[PDB]
Design a protein around this ligand. Structure first.
Ligand SMILES: Nc1ncnc2c1ncn2[C@@H]1O[C@H](CO)[C@@H](O)[C@H]1O
Ligand SMILES: Nc1ncnc2c1ncn2[C@@H]1O[C@H](CO)[C@@H](O)[C@H]1O
Ligand SMILES: Nc1ccn([C@@H]2O[C@H](CO)[C@@H](O)[C@H]2O)c(=O)n1
Ligand SMILES: Nc1ccn([C@@H]2O[C@H](CO)[C@@H](O)[C@H]2O)c(=O)n1
Ligand SMILES: [K+]
Ligand SMILES: [K+]
Lengths: 331, 330
C-alpha cells in the first residue's frame, strides 16, 4: 500500500495581489473579465500603478490545489519555480506551512517571482493579470523523479503551456508516473488557454499521457469549439478516461466511459471572491480519489471545498477542510 | 487652504497575518494583545512556525493616514521602507489610497519592517515586529513644507523604539507649532508606555503634543494605576485634548473639564481587531480637521474602528466616507 504522496501538483508558482474593482475598471484597462490575462513587465507596472490598495496571498492554480489536498488531510507535493526574493520567500513559506512537500530550488533573483494582479468585481468574479517572471525557468531539471514515482496522482495546469520549457517537465512526469503505475491529471485552466493549446491538450488526452481531466463549462466548450455543452460532454468522455466538469453554481458532472455522475453545488451565503474555486474543486476530487472514494463522493468533496473557498478572500481556504468534510459526513 | 489635513509619522511595516489557537501564544512566549519587538533571528524562527499567511500593508500611523484619506481628508505620511518587494508593496498601498508618501528608501538592508500578527479566536491580535528599515528614519526624512502645511501632525509612541525617529518628531513639533498647527500622538501600546513613560509625559507637559490618543490599558500604564478615573483626570491635566478608547465600551473625549462619552457601533462579529485604535484616530482626526464637535469626532472614530475590526487587514477595504454618510455622520 504505502505510497509517499497522494497528489503531486505542478504549476506556475505565483503570488496573488488582490483588489476589488468596479466593472468600468476592466473595460477602461481592456482586461478580459473572468480570464487569465498574460502581461509583460511594463504592463504589470502600469496595471499596478492603477490598482487600489491590495492584499497579497500565495496563489498558483496547482499550488492552491496542493494546499487544498493537504488541508483535507492528504499527502501533497508541489513543483513550481519562484525567484530568490521576498515574494518567493512568501510563496515557499505558505505552501510548506500547509504541509506540502516543496523543494523546487530558485535559480536566482531574476526574473523575479511571478505575480498576478487579480481584480474582483462586485459579482465576485475574478480577472487575473499575470506576469510569469521566474515561472519561465521551470524545466525538466525541476522534476524530482522519486516524488513522481511515489505519488498516486500527478496533476498539472494547462497554464504550463505558456512558459517555454515546462511542457518538457510534464512529459517527463507522464513517463515516470505511468512507468510506476500512477495516474496523470490535468486541468484545462482557462478557456483562452485552451484556445491557445487546443491541439496539444487533445493530444495529451488521446495519447493517454493524461488519465483524468478537469474542465469548467467554458473550457469544455472551447476545447471542441462548440456552443453545445452536451456535445462537449460526449466528446470529452471519449477523449479521456475520467473527466470532471464543473458548472459553477450548477455543480459538477463526473464522466467515466458511458457513466455520468452529477453533483450539486453547496449553499452559498454570499459569493465573496471566486478565485480558486476550480483549484479547490480539484483538491476535493483528488483527495477523495486517492482515498478510494466513489466518483460521486469525489465530486461532492470537490464541490464542498470549492464552495468554501469562494466565501473568503484568498485562493486557499483559511479554515479546516477536513473539519468541514466531517461535518458534511463526507469524512 | 492647507495642503494636508493630517500628516502621520510612524514605523512603515507590512503585516503578515495568521489565525492561531491560544496555545500557540503560550508555546512561543508571545505576549497576547501586545506589540512584541523581535530580532531577525526570532523573526525567522516565528515565521518557520507560522501557518499560511496573508500580507497587507500595516504600520499604525500608516493605517491612520490611509483611513483619513478613505474618509475624504487630505493625508500625508512619513515612514521608511527598504528598496525591496515588501517596500514596494507598502509604497503602492499607501499611495494608491491617495496619501502623499515620498520618504526615500536608503538601501535594501535592513529590509522593510514586517510584523507577524497572530489573531486568536476572540479576534485579539498579537504582533511580532522586526523593525528592519524603520531604524533608519531620522530628521533627514522630515519634509518641512509638508509639516508646515498640515493641520495636524500625528505620530506613534512606537517611534521611541528606533534610535533616531524621536529627533524627526521633535523637528516636526517645532515646525508644526511655528506654523500654528497641532501635534498629536498615540501611546500605541501599554508596554511601549512602560518603556517610555517619562518621555511621553514630557512631550505632553512641555506642549510638544496637543492631542493624545490612548486606550484604557495605555492610560492605566501611563500613570501606573489600576484606577481608570484617576487615569482620566490625570491625562486631562497633561494634554489639551485626550481621546481615550475602551474597546467594546466605546470612547471618552476629554478637554479640560469637558467629557464626551461615545458608544461603540453595532457589529456583525469581531473578525480581527488589528487597526481598531489606528482607525479610531482616523475618524477622530478627520472629524477634527473638518471643524466637527469633539463628540462627532468620537462618533467618526468609533464608526471607522467598528468597520475595521469586521475584516482581515488593518485598513478598511470599503468606503468609510459612504459609511459615514449612511450613519448620518457626514
Ligand atoms: N498563468 C497562470 N498559471 C497558473 N496559475 C495562475 C496563472 N495566473 C493566475 N493564476 C492563479 O490562478 C489562481 C486561481 O485559480 C490564482 O490563485 C492565481 O495565482
Ligand atoms: N513597532 C511598531 N510600530 C508601529 N506600528 C506597528 C508596530 N508593530 C506593529 N505595528 C502595526 O500596528 C498595526 C495595528 O495597530 C498593524 O497594522 C501593525 O503593522
Ligand atoms: N458561483 C459559483 C462558482 C463556483 N462554485 C463552485 O465552484 C466549482 C468550480 O467553479 C463549482 O463546481 C461549484 O462547486 C459555486 O458554488 N458557485
Ligand atoms: N471589541 C472591540 C474593540 C474595539 N472596538 C472599537 O475600536 C476602538 C479602539 O479599540 C474602540 O473605541 C471601539 O470603537 C470595538 O468596537 N469593539
Ligand atoms: K477566494
Ligand atoms: K482588521
Amino acid at each position: 500500500s504505502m505510497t509517499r504522496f497522494d497528489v503531486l501538483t505542478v504549476g506556475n508558482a505565483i503570488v496573488d495581489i488582490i483588489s476589488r474593482c468596479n466593472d468600468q475598471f476592466l473595460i477602461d484597462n481592456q482586461i478580459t473579465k473572468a480570464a487569465m490575462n498574460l502581461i509583460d513587465a511594463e504592463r504589470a507596472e502600469l496595471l499596478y500603478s492603477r490598482m487600489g490598495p491590495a492584499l497579497e496571498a500565495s496563489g498558483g492554480s496547482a499550488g492552491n490545489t496542493a494546499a487544498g489536498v493537504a488541508n483535507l488531510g492528504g499527502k501533497a507535493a508541489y513543483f513550481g519555480n519562484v525567484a530568490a526574493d521576498q515574494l518567493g520567500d512568501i510563496f515557499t513559506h505558505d505552501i510548506r506551512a500547509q504541509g506540502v512537500h516543496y523543494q523546487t530550488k530558485p535559480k536566482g533573483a531574476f526574473p523575479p517571482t511571478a505575480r498576478s494582479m487579480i481584480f474582483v468585481t462586485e459579482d465576485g468574479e475574478r480577472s487575473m493579470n499575470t506576469y510569469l517572471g521566474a515561472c519561465v525557468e521551470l524545466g525538466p531539471e525541476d522534476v524530482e523523479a522519486d516524488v513522481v514515482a511515489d505519488a498516486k496522482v500527478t496533476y498539472f495546469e494547462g497554464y504550463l503551456w505558456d512558459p517555454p520549457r515546462a511542457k518538457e517537465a510534464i512529459l517527463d512526469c507522464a513517463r515516470i508516473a505511468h512507468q510506476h503505475g500512477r495516474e496523470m491529471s490535468m486541468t484545462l485552466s482557462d478557456s483562452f488557454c485552451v484556445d491557445r493549446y487546443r491541439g496539444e491538450f487533445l493530444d495529451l488526452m488521446r495519447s493517454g499521457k493524461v488519465d483524468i481531466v478537469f474542465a469548467n463549462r467554458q473550457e469544455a466548450l472551447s476545447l471542441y469549439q462548440t456552443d453545445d455543452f452536451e456535445e462537449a460532454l460526449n466528446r470529452i468522455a471519449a477523449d479521456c478516461k475520467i473527466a470532471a466538469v464543473t458548472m459553477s453554481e450548477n455543480g459538477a458532472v463526473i464522466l467515466k466511459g458511458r457513466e455520468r455522475y452529477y453533483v450539486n453545488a453547496i449553499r452559498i451565503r454570499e459569493v465573496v471572491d471566486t478565485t480558486g474555486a476550480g483549484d479547490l474543486f480539484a483538491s476535493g476530487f483528488l483527495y477523495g480519489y486517492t482515498q478510494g472514494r466513489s466518483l460521486e463522493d469525489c465530486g461532492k468533496l470537490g464541490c464542498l471545498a470549492a464552495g468554501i473557498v469562494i466565501q473568503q478572500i484568498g485562493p486557499r481556504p483559511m479554515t479546516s477542510l477536513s473539519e468541514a468534510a466531517k461535518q458534511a459526513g463526507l469524512i
